[PDB]
Design a protein around this nucleic acid. Structure first.
Ligand SMILES: [Mg+2]
Ligand SMILES: [Mg+2]
Ligand SMILES: [Mg+2]
Ligand SMILES: [Mg+2]
Ligand SMILES: [Mg+2]
Ligand SMILES: [Mg+2]
Ligand SMILES: [Mg+2]
Ligand SMILES: [Mg+2]
Ligand SMILES: [Mg+2]
Ligand SMILES: [Mg+2]
Ligand SMILES: [Mg+2]
Ligand SMILES: [Zn+2]
Lengths: 152, 115, 108, 102, 59, 217, 304
RNA sequence: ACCUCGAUGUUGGAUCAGGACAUCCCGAUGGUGCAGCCGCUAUUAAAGGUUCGUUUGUUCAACGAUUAAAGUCCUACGUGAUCUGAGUUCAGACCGGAGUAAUCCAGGUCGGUUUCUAUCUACUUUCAAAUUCCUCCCUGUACGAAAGGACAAGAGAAAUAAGGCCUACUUCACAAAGCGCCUUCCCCCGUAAAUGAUAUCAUCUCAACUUAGUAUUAUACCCACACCCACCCAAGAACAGGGUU
């Protein structure tokens, strides 16, 4: 029995859970794109988004500094968080990270996800693209839309 | 809940209850179908080398909402007849004792404080 | 506990060869419109992804050369540049990374 | 005092005399009782000396003179915290630092 | 006219039909009369069924 | 602004409509009986109808020790030592039985629960049954009592020294030893301060409750 | 290959299709808000032995409710959402003693439903419902399909029966499933703490059928009998029922009149075919209450 | 008696029970040396129920407090591939006794290794149509010299059992739980009566027949069937199930 259990147990306990996630997050901050097991990417993903909001609070916020101190192990990334990442996402209220499913790991046969912060410098991931508006079905649907708008 | 082998406190002016002794009074028996005793229930006591019947008056275990909850297990020594051996009850007793089924009127009569 | 009698080949063959224990056919395969290799739907094309990751691998190598040592992640944004292209006016004031090859078609 | 409007104490000659009174009072009660007025129960029929009956807003105590001398119910209810019987008994306090000495 | 069958003697309410559900205490014993009221077809059905050979062809 | 704890709902999969229904019911009751702004440290005197009697009036005074529950069933618990007996009563806020709630002495304590007062010395929970209300100017900061309380011997109802309770209002120096303190530290869980998905922000939620409340009046 | 509705739609068409189908469910609900006006079936006055249709309600949650005697009764809240009549089957065709009425529940998406089911609902002229339950009715109780149903269908003082699928606890041990005592924790007891005891007697060379042993618990239909209806909110269509109701919150329950012998002929005054708000015979207030219920916004209770 | 059981012994206990009625309690009758209250005896009934401690390894028993009662059995004196090992059993030791001794003892006393990864059979949500105690009313009545003290009909409180649930309390905290809350519905097959023959009266009928007596059943629950991309889930070992407007 475990309905509405939100967090998935991960390491060799709750302390380890955090520690793995913190490592993943540290990587992602630094490199801006990271491949890891699908469960762990999904798990860390949330904390990644929550980090940008704390980063949006600014350098001056003492609370936000203490949070950044804990979650970034490199200590050189903390300036980057506050002077690179926070300014980048000024417009958006949410949705800073994208996650995708990529082929399974060779050794292990594990489900693998790539996670990246949006608007990075890197070459863009091959992304799922919906079919063109000029397709036969889309053209017939556009036909129906024309009918409804031109009726009134 | 006061069950078998529970220490209780005799809140009476009765000599037997207030007498200095090496043992605290112990609950021998509970007069209920299931062993647990709430307030108003009768229980048997081993005090000072004798058995005595007693009425439960307030207890530590939480009860219904607006009903009071005491910090000690308080009992009043009664005869088998129903006559309380003591004359006065210093400690407050819950008012709920009134509407409950049984012989409670006499104990209410000798009590000073209702909470 | 221990088996009381040897299981026959027929009994075993019924166990092993029922549809439950068989490999199920995958019906979610498609052609990658980009490269023409096979990809599963709902999953990124293995070929296309390798291609991206080899490019991004080399970019990260150039990042290391310029940064030159640990704990030196800059406090500006970054941009990557190829042979025969120049930073814009808005590109001014951010980290530049150079390349010795032409810009890929897919990377714009 | 959240008990009753009127408290009543009456004495009796003998045990069987007390039953006579209590049983008449309850019997007459039912006669004049309102429909919705709840039914009442006599207390302590097994008891020798003390009988009690509770009504809606009246409470009655039937006793011998013997039990009146030992309970002093009138004194309790007229003057609450100021009666002689409460004075003799004193609250017991645990010692400071919680050390007993012989 | 399976309802209008006749029994010889006191066989209407001497003769019982026994059946057990798998479950403990599942033994049910009903008289021919009381079974007849449940299902009129039942008596004839049970008689014929018992008369056929006890093989796989029976059913 | 002060919003009553009961109005802010817990994290759940309860549909919003259920809360809207309950809020309307609560607000109707608030019109009838004034609910005062009180905190966990504060002193309250509650007057109720007594069903075990023929509509006689009971008042009880004591110190609040906890405030919990949501919607109509939301409650608080009052403590007091009456003539050498500790008494605790849990009261429903929206019970029709209650006649009047008054704030006799409005103060916060260091911590949000005071259930340790059972284990504290008797006098810290002993409050005069007949005391005069003491009132302060409307636009004043809610005053905090920074009292720490002395304790009984170490067998307690709960192990208060453990950091999960996070009690700031106990004189630990007096009762515990240094080794006991460092023993308690084995249960620290320092990551829990920085767990980001563990937190519950009620900002937008409270805003919408305010919108409902201002509409009601 | 399997195809869902989005496979071949551009970003431009997706919002358009979404809004189009949303419009049509609203239009279909709009059409049927006037049952009596549209050519209905004959309405018969109630006589003894008659059974009427029920409802399909969603369990919102739970609340306290107070009575004048001062007692606290917990109520469960049941919201009637897009409840309609689907199909009528005569006593002949159903092969039952009673005729049957089909009732639909929570409105659901057309895109996730089966072909035939979509066809069925198209013929009706209503959007697809999540649950369907069948009610056993007498001949007089017949209601033309497509007719909506409302919470005021029930009135306070009425007792109801409530059936839903219980909360699913998956594969459970014998101890939590059947409340077996289990074995002591100390004094030896090697690797036996929660095990079922001796299963059966040694004489029998088997295990009796229907023995209690560890297995899948919950997730089955259970009914609660004789729940009093304390209160009706007419605006939101809320039924307030006494005590606990089976299944989780935001689940669909089947609620009908109580079957119990005590309340066998209590349906006299209760709106027989159904309650028709469109009738305008008397406009029902915001709320309906039982006599004993303390009104929210009424003066504080005295026992005087 | 027996070439039938047992090489991880047997007694108890734990857990979980299945069944019989020769019924301990609750139900229905007949008689009574049945005024009423308790009682005594017999017929019918196995749906349900049948307590907790102390002494002793206790099965027994005694003792204490209860109850409505604390039934009698059978099931390899049920059940140890589900569990203990307390007594009695192997290697050590002592008291007492036998014996020249080695050693022994139906006595007393201390210590002493309980394996198994389930192949097959069987089974793993069938239905609860719920039982009982107490208090009050009748009534303090009938009855009875008094003392005492009813039955049907009805009301309220509890306790357990089954099935659920989380608004409060509580362990806790997107939830799960009890110490908490909600619901819980048919009757018994023994006799008591008429009318009326054999046997013109009478007679309750293994006579024809007529009422207690339905001398058999409920009602309720479930009940449509795409894609089986992917995601989510109050659904879940996997699988399946629900939602995805
Ligand atoms: Mg692991
Ligand atoms: Mg404790
Ligand atoms: Mg246990
Ligand atoms: Mg072992
Ligand atoms: Mg163990
Ligand atoms: Mg021979
Ligand atoms: Mg042999
Ligand atoms: Mg018999
Ligand atoms: Mg035998
Ligand atoms: Mg065995
Ligand atoms: Mg040893
Ligand atoms: Zn490709």
């Amino acid at each position: 029995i475990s309905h509405g259990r939100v967090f998935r147990r991960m390491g060799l306990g709750p302390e380890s859970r955090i520690h793995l996630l913190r490592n993943l997050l540290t990587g992602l901050v630094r490199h801006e794109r990271i491949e890891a097991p699908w469960a762990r990417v999904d798990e860390m993903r949330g904390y990644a988004e929550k980090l940008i909001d704390y980063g949006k609070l600014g350098d001056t916020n003492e609370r936000a500094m203490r949070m950044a101190d804990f979650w970034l192990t490199e200590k050189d990334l903390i300036p980057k968080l506050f002077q690179v990442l926070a300014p980048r996402y000024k417009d958006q209220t949410g949705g800073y990270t994208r996650m995708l499913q990529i082929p399974n790991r060779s050794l292990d046969r594990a489900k693998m996800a790539v996670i990246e912060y949006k608007g990075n410098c890197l070459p863009p991931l091959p992304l799922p693209r919906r079919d063109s508006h000029l397709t036969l079905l889309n053209q017939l649907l556009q036909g129906l839309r024309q009918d409804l708008r031109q009726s009134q | 809940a006061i069950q078998k082998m529970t220490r209780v406190r005799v809140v009476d002016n009765s000599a037997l209850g207030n007498s200095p002794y090496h043992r605290a009074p112990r609950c021998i028996h509970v007069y209920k179908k299931n062993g647990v005793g709430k307030v108003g229930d009768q229980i048997l006591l081993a005090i000072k080398g004798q058995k005595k019947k007693a009425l439960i008056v307030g207890h530590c275990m939480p009860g219904p909402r607006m009903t009071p909850r005491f910090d000690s297990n308080n009992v009043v020594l009664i005869e088998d007849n129903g006559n309380p051996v003591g004359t006065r009850i210093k400690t407050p007793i819950p008012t709920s004792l009134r509407k409950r089924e049984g012989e409670y009127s006499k104990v209410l009569a000798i009590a000073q404080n209702f909470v | 506990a221990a088996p009381k009698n040897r299981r026959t080949i027929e009994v075993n063959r019924c166990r092993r060869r029922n549809p439950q224990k068989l490999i199920k056919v995958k019906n979610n395969i498609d052609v990658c419109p980009e490269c023409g290799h096979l990809k599963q739907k709902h999953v990124l094309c293995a070929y296309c992804y390798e291609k991206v990751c080899k490019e991004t691998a080399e970019i990260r190598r150039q990042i290391g050369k310029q940064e030159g040592g640990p704990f030196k992640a800059p406090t500006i944004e970054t941009v990557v540049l190829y042979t025969g292209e120049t930073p814009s006016e808005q590109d001014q004031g951010k980290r530049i990374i150079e390349r010795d090859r032409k810009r890929p078609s897919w990377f714009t | 005092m959240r008990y009753t409007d009127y408290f009543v104490i009456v004495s009796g000659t003998s045990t069987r005399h007390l039953h006579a009174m209590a049983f008449y009072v309850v019997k007459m009660y039912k006669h004049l009782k309102c429909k919705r007025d709840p039914h009442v129960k006599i207390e302590g029929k097994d008891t020798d000396d003390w009988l009690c009956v509770d009504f809606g807003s009246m409470v009655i105590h039937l006793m011998l003179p013997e039990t009146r001398e030992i309970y002093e119910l009138e004194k309790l209810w007229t003057l609450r915290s100021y009666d002689d019987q409460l004075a003799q008994i004193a609250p017991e306090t645990v010692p400071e630092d919680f050390i007993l000495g012989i | 006219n399976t309802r209008h069958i006749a029994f010889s003697g006191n066989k209407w309410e001497q003769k019982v039909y026994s059946s057990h559900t798998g479950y403990p205490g599942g033994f049910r014993q009903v008289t021919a009369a009381q079974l007849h009221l449940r299902d009129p077809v039942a008596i004839v059905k049970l008689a014929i069924y018992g008369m056929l050979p006890k093989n796989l062809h029976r059913r | 602004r002060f919003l009553s704890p009961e109005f802010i709902p817990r994290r759940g999969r309860t549909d919003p409509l259920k809360f809207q229904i309950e809020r309307k019911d609560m607000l109707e009751r608030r019109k009838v009986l004034h609910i005062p702004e009180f905190y966990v440290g504060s002193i309250l005197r509650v007057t109720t109808a007594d069903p075990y009697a023929s509509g006689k009036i009971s008042q009880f005074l004591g110190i609040c020790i906890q405030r919990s529950g949501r919607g109509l069933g939301a409650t608080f618990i009052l403590r007091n030592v009456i003539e050498g007996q500790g008494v605790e009563i849990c009261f429903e806020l929206y019970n029709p039985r209650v006649q009047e709630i008054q704030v006799v002495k409005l103060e916060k304590r260091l911590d949000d629960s005071l259930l340790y007062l059972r284990d504290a010395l008797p006098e810290y929970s002993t409050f005069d049954v007949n005391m005069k209300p003491v009132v302060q100017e409307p636009n004043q900061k809610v005053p905090v009592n920074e009292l720490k309380v002395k304790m009984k011997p170490k067998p307690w109802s709960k192990r208060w020294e453990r950091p999960n309770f996070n009690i700031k209002g106990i004189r630990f120096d007096l009762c515990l030893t240094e080794q006991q303190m460092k023993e308690a530290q084995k249960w620290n869980q320092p990551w829990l301060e920085f767990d980001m998905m563990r937190e519950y922000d009620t900002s937008k939620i409270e805003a919408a409750i305010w919108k409902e409340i201002e509409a009601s009046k | 290959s399997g195809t869902w509705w989005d496979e071949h739609l551009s970003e431009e068409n997706v919002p358009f299709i979404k809004q189009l189908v949303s419009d049509e469910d609203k239009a279909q609900l709009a059409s049927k808000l006037c049952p009596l006006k549209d050519e209905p079936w004959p309405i018969h006055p109630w006589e003894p032995g008659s059974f009427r249709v029920g409802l399909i309600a969603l369990k919102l949650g739970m609340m306290p409710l107070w009575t004048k005697d001062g007692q606290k009764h917990v109520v469960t809240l049941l919201q009637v959402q897009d409840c309609h009549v689907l199909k009528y089957t005569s006593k002949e065709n159903c092969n039952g003693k009673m005729a049957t009425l089909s009732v639909g529940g929570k409105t659901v998406s057309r895109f996730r439903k089966a072909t035939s089911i979509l066809e069925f609902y198209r013929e009706l002229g209503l959007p697809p419902k999540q649950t369907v339950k069948i009610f056993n009715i007498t001949d007089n109780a017949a209601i033309k399909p497509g007719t909506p149903l409302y919470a005021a269908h029930f009135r306070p003082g009425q007792y109801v029966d409530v059936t839903a699928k219980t909360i699913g606890k998956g594969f459970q041990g014998v101890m939590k499933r059947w409340g077996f005592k289990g074995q002591p924790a100390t004094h030896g007891q090697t690797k036996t703490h929660r095990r079922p005891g001796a299963v059966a007697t040694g004489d029998i060379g088997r295990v009796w059928p229907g023995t209690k042993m560890p297995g899948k618990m919950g997730n089955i239909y259970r009914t609660e009998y004789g729940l009093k209806v304390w209160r009706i909110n007419t605006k939101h269509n809320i039924i307030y029922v006494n005590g606990s109701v089976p299944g989780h919150k935001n689940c669909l329950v089947k609620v009908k009149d109580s079957k119990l012998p005590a309340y066998k002929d209590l349906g006299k005054n209760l709106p027989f075919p159904t309650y028709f708000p469109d009738g305008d015979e008397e406009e029902l207030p915001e709320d309906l209450y039982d006599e004993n219920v303390c009104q929210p916004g009424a003066p504080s209770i005295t026992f005087a």
